[PDB]
Amino acid sequence: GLEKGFTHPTDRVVRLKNMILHAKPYVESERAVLATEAYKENEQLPAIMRRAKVVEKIFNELPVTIRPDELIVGAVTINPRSTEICPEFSYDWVEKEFDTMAHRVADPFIIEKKTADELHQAFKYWPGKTTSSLAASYMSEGTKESMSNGVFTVGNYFFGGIGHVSVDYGKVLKIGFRGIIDEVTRALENLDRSTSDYIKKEQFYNAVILSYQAAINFAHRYAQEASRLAREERDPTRQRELEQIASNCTRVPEYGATTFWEACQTFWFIQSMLQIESSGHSISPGRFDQYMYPYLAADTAISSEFAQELVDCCWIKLNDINKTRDEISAQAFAGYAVFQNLCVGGQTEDGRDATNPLTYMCMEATAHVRLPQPSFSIRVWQGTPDEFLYRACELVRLGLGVPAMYNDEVIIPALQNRGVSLHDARDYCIIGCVEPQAPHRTEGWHDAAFFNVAKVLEITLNNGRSGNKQLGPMTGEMTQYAGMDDFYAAFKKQMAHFVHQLVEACNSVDIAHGERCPLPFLSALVDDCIGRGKSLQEGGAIYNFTGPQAFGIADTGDSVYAIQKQVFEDRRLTLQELKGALDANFGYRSGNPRYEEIRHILENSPCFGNDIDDVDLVARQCALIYCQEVEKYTNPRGGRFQAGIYPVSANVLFGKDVSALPDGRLAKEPLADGVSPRQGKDTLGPTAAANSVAKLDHFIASNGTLYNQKFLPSSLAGEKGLRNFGGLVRNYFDKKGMHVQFNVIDRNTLLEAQKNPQQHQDLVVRVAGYSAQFVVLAKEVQDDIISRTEQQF
Amino acid sequence: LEKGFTHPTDRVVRLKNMILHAKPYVESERAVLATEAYKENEQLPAIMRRAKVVEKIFNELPVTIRPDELIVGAVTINPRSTEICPEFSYDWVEKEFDTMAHRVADPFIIEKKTADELHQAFKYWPGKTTSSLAASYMSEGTKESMSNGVFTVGNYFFGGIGHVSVDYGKVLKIGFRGIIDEVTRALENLDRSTSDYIKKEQFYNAVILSYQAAINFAHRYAQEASRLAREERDPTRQRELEQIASNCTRVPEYGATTFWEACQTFWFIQSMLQIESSGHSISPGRFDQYMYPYLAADTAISSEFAQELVDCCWIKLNDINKTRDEISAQAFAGYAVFQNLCVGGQTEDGRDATNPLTYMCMEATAHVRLPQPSFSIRVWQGTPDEFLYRACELVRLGLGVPAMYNDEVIIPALQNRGVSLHDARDYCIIGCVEPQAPHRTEGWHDAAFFNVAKVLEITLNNGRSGNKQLGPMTGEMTQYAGMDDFYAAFKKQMAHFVHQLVEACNSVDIAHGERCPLPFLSALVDDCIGRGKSLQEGGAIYNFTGPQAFGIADTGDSVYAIQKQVFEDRRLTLQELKGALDANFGYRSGNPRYEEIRHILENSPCFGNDIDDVDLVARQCALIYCQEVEKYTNPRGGRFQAGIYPVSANVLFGKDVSALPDGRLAKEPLADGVSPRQGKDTLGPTAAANSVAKLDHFIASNGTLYNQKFLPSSLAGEKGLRNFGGLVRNYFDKKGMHVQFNVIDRNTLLEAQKNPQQHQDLVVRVAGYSAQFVVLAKEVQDDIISRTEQQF
């Protein structure tokens, strides 16, 4: 039948998994100190070559750590699941939090006193030499003022690195780091030196070669440590394993991989070393089943058991990565999350189905390991085999939140509309949460900013004011609107004003990374950086984008529709009472009963998510106004802005920035997640809700849309549960929604994990486009997830 | 045709003598303030950091008005002294703390207090200079070639760029306030629909901040004038200081309303540019054109006072000084900053541009008689006879000035490089001999020195320099079947070393763009404001890079000596010549066949005697350099173009060249510019001029330099002047670009050598500029003494 169940992992895998779950996250100092010394030593160099010296010093000198039982080795931090510090982007919040980071609510980390003193010393170098400090210098005062008041934020790449990329893993698997050096050497040989342009290109080429020579050394340093351990090792079986690891790391990634186990080690070295060079998250394995499977197929000696165990170790290694952020940013990316998205299935470049045996081993690994990472995903298209969808649904039914599901049939045309070739778009993977790209061909900036559309609505209805600040243009007081035409004219003018500032802030950060932190190790693994002689930060990628995310879509749509119906059409209240009610927070604090009555009238208007065309098209319209403004703009890499709609863990945080709204929500309350209907307001079941969500224009939001559903576990039980569950996905994708993902959990389970967190350390559930340990999320985020609508067939 | 010259006021003489008697110091204030501004502004884009640098200096540098001055503004507290600009380079300053006061070329005093102050500021700079970044962009082969003396880019490597004539006329008319208004309007009109506006707006904000501080700087001189006036016991001087205070309140914040104000506008621009950056050759250019409207409109001023103000400007120009590292100072010797000022020529409509201020500028040179300005005249087909003959009277004073430039070569030469006919007609001279369309050009007119005679050395040694493989293996000279083989080999060596020359220049170019774009200077050249980009990033309408050839006559006479003595007349073999060159013609060994070979080579026909065969070899060797250079471009979207001029370095770089086939011994001086070799033009000045004009001057559009030296007897009287003007017209009609003249007796120079204390005021041409003879190193003095003395 359709239900096959899941196998169990080896005991070794269970021990490696538990080592992650029991690890206390620390902040560590060695990479930050080494990086700092590389900067001090190399003031005179062009940035790209300074950055080669940075990775050279780190790769040569960072501590090398092999953990008990690992088959796949490489550690960013001495301690499991800990974080380096990357002061080149920002530092001052680390020192401000030396004594509070261990106790903050979202993502605490231990900072021992010696580590604090070491970081204090290194940070003396940094004032005004970070990328952030330069980015801020480029921004206008109005742009900064809008961000200060919570219209939008570019914190992600302002305080940290970029990342958000799926590199050419298959190229390194084939030709190795030595092959990269060879390609660069040939580019040097063939350089046109007849003008001045060759000088900087040769700097880049030499920086890449130096970086990859050092990257070879790094792998050999792990081979050397594996051999030292083998010579002390007492169990002859573990000795043989350590000897094989030393052999693997001698071969890869310097040279192409010759076994599946070597291929896994090539993969993990690339995965970890990128996040050593830079703190940018969303380093996404992408189509792991596609580029890894030739190395499994050609390995005639490996058993299916050992091959699965290796994939399991990879899943577990992916959970060893961690990242601290400033105390507020950490609330927006909560759960010790670095968003390594790994997808399976879909189509080949020729448009044939891409399922292979490793596709299903990746699903098994998720069932074996059951940890937050990777952010595991499936691609779905019209020829997806029934067995692949049903197997994925059977995995979703375990309640980990994974796999998220992505619709080829929308994403491919969406990418084509942005200039991506049909051949490249067929090969897409997902970056981070929900963001599609042609892998190893894109500098996508897929989480460049968070933009609060509900805040823009607030400000529109207050004639451009926020508090006692004139923040936007004076588009008119809401009491002067003659009808919905007037509102929309004013909203578009506020949107144009604030989106222009959003683009300024993004491009300022973009310029700052180009001037100060171009990356010679990462850049060599993305087309066409080598061919062009330019880093990713300078536009070397074939495709260039910048992706800012809308917050409050359903909140804005339902509020605008409430004005349409309750004021203009049915005349239940006047524009003047609405203004007074909004200013008084519906009388939350004064107890005004007319405002409370008005709140009740507004709350009971039709809402997005019940398959009601009227109100659904207002949500579509409000989202379109944002998406249509964003796409008018370009970045300094010659690329195009494109909107996304996803919340990571910040729809609570950014709700705190918005006063009362015309749909009846009180000041500072949470916003809706992604394109999902407002929490608890879709009450006609999952098909009706999916039908509403699919009415939005997903194609124009080509940085990715995010739709969350949550099911009662018993509704998915049995073969008929899988049948219905698969039919729901096909329905939604046939109606041109881009993405959907599922929690499958009982309300009491979430409540119990709140009351007795020490017994629920392994409870992993979906937040938004990624999964996390429920108990490490702040209570207000836990409560928001609990408040989500419970679906049932 | 002889009027004589008037005498300056006693004030002008006192001011002039202050310059002669001044002992040059190194000073620390500007360097310390600059450093603090960098430290305080790490986070800014470079252009804004550079605005913060000039804002701190303009706000805080000591304000110094000197006794008797009518025109005020001091770069240094002490007269004739130098600031330090560590943003370009610093380590040689501190290396020389104890030796700079005693070095042979251009000593400066460094008091202990000053060295301590500089020692502390220098702690900031390791690896943060433009030079340290420029070196990092260069290939090892390029640095190796420079280490072995093939060429050097030291000028803009160790120091600022400069080499520009800014829009003085625009500031005279609209002031700094008008610059700010133009930028405010560019900001208003900015297209903000893409990402390109972000950096443009940084540039605009940097410019506005710079010019707000520039206005404060002039007001600070107004305050000090007003303070000095309050303390002045002499009533006449009191009124002068009050009038100075009023001038400095008006200009250059606003446009000038009197001639005395216009003179104060000019000098504020001239001095403040060289506070922002140590780049020299900040050239007033066509002073008589843009200043004359302000003289004509000034109905109240007397002729004598207008003359005395022009004299005060001449003397202020001599207040500027610049230290360089001990070796670089030998190449720019004489406390020299090369501020070239020309008069006459044509208007942009092709009519003669002489006006009454033209002749007052000539009188100022006769009044003042100091090294600066580097005074020049333009000469065209319609030059009035009275202007040429007055210029020749001034030349007879033996100061070396005016240098003479030929519109009829320079304008089509600039046209060949894309300059519009309208812009080319408005050309001035930069520095020594380098022409440009003023306030329209970022020309880099002295970006490098390139030793063509060294390339010849290396060619004949199959790419070797002292058993070091510096160039390609084009073949040993003993395998040349004829001159065709030599020229093939020489062109291959030239292409190799000019590619490295261009790399080194462009590396310095990139470094200045990345780390030191200039928001004060840039606003005064088209089209930086309209484009929203600095000069360092290509804001100028016209962009060039200009490297200078050395050893042209040496190379031509050597190459011809092989042609005649080896191939044609078979008087020695290639093997003997190779042996004689390696052995320095037996200078140590006493080998008599090598001495006989040297005599044979020394007596070959030589460039400079109107002999076509040898002259065309000099032409061909110079073309090979100029034709290679112009194949290349710079990062500002502009074009390389060769010049030929030595400043004071033809002795210095002769030390890098071993024996040559023309018979010169190892390490001996090279020839200056396009001039014939020292003492080798023996048939007189018309013959020598006829030879020089056979070179292709048009392709050497960064400027050529031709020195002549006359016995004063041969220019005496009315007959002397007619002969002298006829010589100039002969040479320019035959399409030479430039000529200038020493007019001095041999014994005068020799006496200055033995009794320098009684000849501190002796001023003579070095090359493209004049200097106090007693300040030049003995070997430079001897080289000038050895130049051919001409006679009609």
Side-chain angles (χ1 to χ4, degrees), chain A residues 43-47 50 127-129 133-135 137-140 193-196 198-200 202-203 500 503-504 507-508 511 515-516 632-637, chain B residues 42-46 49 126-128 132-134 136-139 192-195 197-199 201-202 499 502-503 506-507 510 514-515 631-636:
Chain A
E43 296 287 351
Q44 80 275 10
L45 292 180
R50 181 159 45 254
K129 297 178 179 176
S133 68
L134 176 65
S137 301
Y138 275 117
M139 294 176 192
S140 76
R193 298 171 189 264
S194 65
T195 72
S196 62
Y198 85 84
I199 290 167
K200 285 178 77 68
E202 155 161 308
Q203 281 296 316
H500 186 273
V503 168
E504 202 184 71
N507 287 339
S508 294
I511 292 164
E515 321 204 308
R516 283 191 173 185
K632 297 176 186 177
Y633 292 99
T634 52
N635 61 40
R637 293 164 283 114
Chain B
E42 296 289 353
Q43 80 279 15
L44 298 179
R49 171 182 309 117
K128 297 180 187 171
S132 68
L133 177 63
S136 299
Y137 279 115
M138 300 180 194
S139 78
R192 296 161 190 270
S193 66
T194 68
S195 64
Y197 86 82
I198 292 165
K199 286 178 73 67
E201 155 167 312
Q202 285 291 314
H499 189 270
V502 168
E503 201 184 72
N506 287 342
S507 288
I510 295 167
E514 316 207 315
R515 286 189 171 183
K631 296 175 181 178
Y632 293 97
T633 55
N634 62 40
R636 292 163 283 115

Side-chain angles (χ1 to χ4, degrees), chain A residues 117-133:
Chain A
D117 290 337
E118 287 160 351
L119 291 170
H120 176 72
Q121 271 307 124
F123 292 170
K124 292 178 179 179
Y125 174 78
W126 284 105
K129 297 178 179 176
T130 58
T131 52
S132 60
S133 68

Side-chain angles (χ1 to χ4, degrees), chain A residues 4-15:
Chain A
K4 294 112 163 73
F6 300 97
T7 60
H8 295 289
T10 65
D11 294 330
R12 175 202 327 247
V13 168
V14 177
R15 295 194 298 277

